Write an enzyme that holds these catalytic residues in place. Sequence first.
Site, short mmCIF file in Angstrom:
data_model
loop_
_atom_site.label_atom_id
_atom_site.label_comp_id
_atom_site.label_asym_id
_atom_site.label_seq_id
_atom_site.Cartn_x
_atom_site.Cartn_y
_atom_site.Cartn_z
CD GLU A 50 6.03 15.35 46.10
OE1 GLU A 50 4.84 15.08 45.87
OE2 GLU A 50 6.44 16.52 46.29
CG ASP A 88 8.18 17.19 42.71
OD1 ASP A 88 7.18 17.86 43.02
OD2 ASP A 88 8.31 16.62 41.61
CD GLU A 101 11.13 18.96 40.17
OE1 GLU A 101 10.02 18.41 40.03
OE2 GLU A 101 11.26 20.10 40.65
CE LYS A 114 8.03 16.40 34.20
NZ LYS A 114 7.47 17.78 34.28
CG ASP A 1193 27.90 7.34 -6.41
OD1 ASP A 1193 27.64 7.69 -7.57
OD2 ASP A 1193 29.04 6.98 -6.06
#
Length: 1612
Positions: A50, A88, A101, A114, A1193
């Site tokens: 992060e 985030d 994020e 996600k 068909d």
Amino acid sequence: DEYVQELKGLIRKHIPDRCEFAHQKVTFLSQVHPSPLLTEGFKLLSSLVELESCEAHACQANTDQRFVDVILSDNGILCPTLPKVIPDGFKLTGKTLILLETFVRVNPDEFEKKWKADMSKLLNLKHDLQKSGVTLVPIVDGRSNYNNRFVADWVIERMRWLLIEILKASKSMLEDQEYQRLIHSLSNVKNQSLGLENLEHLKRNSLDYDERLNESLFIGLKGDIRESTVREELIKLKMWFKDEVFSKGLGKFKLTDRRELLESLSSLGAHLDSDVSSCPFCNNKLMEIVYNVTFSSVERTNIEKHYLSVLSLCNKIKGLKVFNTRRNTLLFLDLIMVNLMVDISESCQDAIESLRKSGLIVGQMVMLVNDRVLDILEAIKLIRKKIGTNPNWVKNCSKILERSHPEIWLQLNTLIRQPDFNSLISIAQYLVSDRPIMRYSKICRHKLFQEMSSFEQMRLFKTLSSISLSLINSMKTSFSSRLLVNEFGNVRLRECYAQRFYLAESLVGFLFYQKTGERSRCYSVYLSDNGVMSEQGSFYCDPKRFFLPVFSDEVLAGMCEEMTSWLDFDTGLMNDTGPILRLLVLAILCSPSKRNQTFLQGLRYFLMAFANQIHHIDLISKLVVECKSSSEVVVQRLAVGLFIRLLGGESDASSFFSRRFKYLLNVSYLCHLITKETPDRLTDQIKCFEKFIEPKVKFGCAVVNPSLNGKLTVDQEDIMINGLKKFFSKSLRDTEDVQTPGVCKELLNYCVSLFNRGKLKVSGELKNNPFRVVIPKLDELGNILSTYDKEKLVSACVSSMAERFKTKGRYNLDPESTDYLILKNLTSQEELSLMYETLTEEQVESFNEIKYDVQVALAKMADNSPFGVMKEIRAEVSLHEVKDFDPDVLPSDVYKELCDAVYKSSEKCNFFLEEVLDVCPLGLLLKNLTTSSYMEEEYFMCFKYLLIQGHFDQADKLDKSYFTNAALRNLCFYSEDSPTEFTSISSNSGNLKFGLSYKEQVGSNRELYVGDLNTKLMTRLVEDFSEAVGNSMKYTCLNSEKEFERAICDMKMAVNNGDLSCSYDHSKWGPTMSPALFLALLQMLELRTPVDRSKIDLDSVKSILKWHLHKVVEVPINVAEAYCIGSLSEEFFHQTMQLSGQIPSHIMSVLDMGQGILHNTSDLYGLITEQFLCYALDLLYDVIPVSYTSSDDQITLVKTPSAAEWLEMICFHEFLSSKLNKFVSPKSVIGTFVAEFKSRFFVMGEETPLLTKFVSAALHNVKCKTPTQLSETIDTICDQCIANGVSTKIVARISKRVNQLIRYSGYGDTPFGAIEDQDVKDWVDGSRGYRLQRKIEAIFYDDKETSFIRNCARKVFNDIKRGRIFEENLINLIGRGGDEALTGFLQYAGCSEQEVNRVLNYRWVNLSSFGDLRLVVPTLIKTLQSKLSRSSVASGFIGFCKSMGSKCVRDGKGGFLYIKEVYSGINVCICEICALKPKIIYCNDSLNKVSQFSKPILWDYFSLVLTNACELGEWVFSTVKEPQLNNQNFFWAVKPKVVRQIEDQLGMNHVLQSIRRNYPVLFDELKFLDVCIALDMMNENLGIISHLLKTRDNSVYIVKQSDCALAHIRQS
């Protein structure tokens, strides 16, 4: 806890670099405990990823990780009551903010779900955050691995490898379904072949709903029915059917009553009730204009080239925008053009009269810039108005075309030349011609087309080609291109866009239109015979459906002459059917619509119904379409009059029915000339969703929005289970309810339980068992940009720019670099316009929307009196800003035209600036970006900028340490959306989404569901299962060439035998059937594998068709707004608004069957049930039928013992197929004369050539990358077209058309080009290499300069061949060049240097020499990587011609130039060389100034002769000999007759020989192949190996007798 002490030392190799490390590390050493070790010693990885993705973009490291409401409330900002979500990362400066994020998913299966849920959490936040006074850029870092910077990929893979024992130790010492998804999330970069064997180790729980699914679905299935009880049931059923409902006359099939079909046809198409005229020209608004053009010209220049040269120079000087606004960068070169007009007027005496009236400018008109007609006097106003604005105007605007400029201005003096206004009044007062009128919205005199001679019937198609080219190059006008005057039926036209078209030396035509773009315009067509303007009409039509006639006078005239010459059995009937078909083709070309397209699609069903002996009862109600205009009535009368002309006669007019069927079949496939682009997409997505949902709510199963994750509510459960037992009820003995979608479960039990025994002609044996980035959002398919991408690249541009201007403290933008990054990641002013004009109008307006909200979001970034009441603020302005809530989509129908201008026309205040200011400081766009339309011509764009201006935009936690259901979203890699524990209705991750789009089929749009990626995987599993099932099945043909060819052979021998051979179809094969039917079929299938003689487990296919039973089909977002404005689906969406008032955006239903989704799984159903019907008709009506299946068909070829008196059998087959929801369509026709299957129609003794579908294929789909590739693809299509034996005249005229399409694009002509004219045998004997050999040796019509080089090729070929080596190492001599390699081969084969002197002067000028024609590695490596690895037509051709006349061709240095600049470095070399073929062949000395492109034609001819010695030959070396009657319409089959003297299966024998050719090319990315593998790496026009490893793909050529006996001969 045996490596818990190891982990204190394992993560000790990390310096506490930032605050996110030491604060997490000081609590680590204070406790030795495995319960926070798997959470707090494990979320450090997620926090580090992060923080790395926060370090990537602009961000502030939120270590608290708190709400969006509290992150706005740092300074004084009032709360807008935000939805409670967690970001985030935040970056708030000014009045904008970046939500970023960070999620990582190692596989693409759950990478996209996600991402979609994350971005839909970010797009459900803008509607409440936009109203606060702030717009955001939602960015995400979607990943697939771990790529941090604080670690370097050597400890974090050991964070999941050495720690694999501690969680097993926790589960052995001390959670249930949150355990296996944490293992599936911490996987490696997986080569994870998840087959059906995945679904075994899923959980398979129950919901107490699957029991009632089985109670509704699987009770009547037993799979144990004896072989005698089926017979005793079906004989009693036939005794019921024959005495019950066949004798009372409810049969779906009758005996055609051939007199009555023509009467119903005359009542069907010939609209005698309608008030239409019999003249085709009076009723169609464009045939009248074509008639007026072509009958004003049959009965009857140094200044011109200077004016066209300065016009092209003005076109080159406009596309730079050096004049800082889009208003004066049109009027300034308008002034240049009018000064050059008055300069040419002062040049000669009769100059503007004789060589201009007859040429470019007409009475009170000056042609200019963007194909614009200006009608001169307005400029005499405007320039004077400009000298009212700037009196000393031309003093610096000429020097800005000197400095900061191209700096080469070839104008005489017209920059600073202030025009003498009295002179312009004198010239404009001379040209006294009527102003143009442009008509919107009687008597007849049009000379009766059937009576006119065939000389002027060609003139109609030629002038249609000229006018159609004028329509097609109306996309060539720029798409911003704002005019100088704003702007109701008949308009006296002030100044307009105008294309031209030539007819003779004296007269030119015109095409006037007001609007730029690609949609349907109100065109207006004038001629000018000697300078007099003359009105000839004004039509409203759509240009991009006219790519068919654009250069094809000769093609369409030739196919009409061929199609008429099919009727050489009656002379007067031929001369009567000639002009009526030619008029039909003219009406269809001149009026391309969808409704007459659908009618001509119905005419082949009518032709089969009249042809065969039995046809369906309900087709006449479907063959007719309601004519929207009087234009469709013309063609619907002409085709019906044609059919009644040569079907119903006073005599027995069915004598030669084969040629009549051929001719009328091509009349009905002449449908295909109309372009299948569906004129508007938003009125086609409506019809797609309506075709989707009409049987679904007619049967009663469509629901409103499901939960999207597993569960269904109790009312949805009830309506689902009620639709299930309504689907499966359908008892076998009621003759009503025969159209209701559903299956008779009792007869389905008979079907599957007789399939369990080996008594059908198929059986369940199942050899070799089957158990082995940008993604769109599903709310909008068929579009060009998703809602995600339309902000994804906005996000990319804002994230790229938000760091680059704060490197020093600039706080500004460049107003062209902010138009560069969007224009790069979507597709320095030459650098912009180089790839700006490679777009489509939809892409242009998408680029405009992206430029809009990018410049808004940038203008918000540095941000730290509406009382002009003429109308009321809160009643109009604030009301329209609060009803729509968006300044972006403020419409143009809610206001007036003048109120947009007068609110714009307020006085100068602090909201505007003057002096423009192209420096553009950021944040001061509030007074800058609005004034770019206050000084420019548009007004409503400034109105929307003013509306967005003045703010009208508004211990328990020790037990909860492990990630429980309340602790699922703490991490970044946790993967909550994994397939973990599937219910019987979902898969624990999603709910099997799909989408809506259409296929752009010819007549009626097939719908097409784009699946979600997880649903693509779960679809491919069942699809590969069913494909491996059908591989063992013997009567399917959806994948096999083998069984489809056996169906063709059986069909030919049955129609020859006179056996009655049906041709079924299935009405709505998609929207009728259900996956619950597939469950009920798979429950009692045995599939006893020959490995293990046992019933295999089908639960791996059943528990995923239970997911396909409950699929959440999306809606188009463009139909949830087209049904929000105000028709049974329009009733359905408006009656569910009285229900729960959420938007019905999702549909789950019993009966879905995605078309192309569950295709082969329905093919096994339509094989098993069809062989059940074929076994029933074997016993009950004592025939021996054999039936094929293509999943939509069919054909059931029926042998007969000992006339169609077995209507019993056929109606009973229709009844039983209706009881198994194989609803026989009214398109189905059965009889002993015509048998179709997958549109390949067989007649007795022959086969229908079916010309016009392949001709319209060759004239459409002209895909345009390079003319080498273009005449590669169209040579392939002409090979497929002449495989059917059309002619060698029609293919030669298609060749002339495609060569004119190349020549019109500015490429000029080259000896390769398209393939040649009069190509009579080179299709059977030869690939494109032999045809280019023929085209090069047809330039030399003496064949003296080519027999020597063929003798040289013989000397090389006899040396290189088998039995001897003779320097096989020619790898390096060819790769040096074209000149020295030809000299080396010519001196190694043996001759003097005088032959080198006389050969190497023939030099064709190349353009793709140093590279390719760049209009945005050889073709050898491209073809080998295409093999080894496994949006209209006219608007592509105009984007091709627009980007070929520009700077495309390259030189040896880094750079590019024009094609005409290369063709200007040229000389004249009269003596026997350059005049051999003009502008094709040159001297070596004639190309002195441009010699870098002078490649030989003899070297490329030598390369082609060696290639046609590789791919075939020993006869391509001989002299073309002199060839030497029979019927014109007697075609017969010929064999390809090829001697390819190499060893076959070249898929590996050339890849391993690329090491011997180019080792680094294979690194970074036989006995006879090697001599002709280096001949292809160096050029592009050869294509040696594409016809070597692949096959011919036809190898079954039928040709006419007159195109094979008349053909040449080249014997060894």
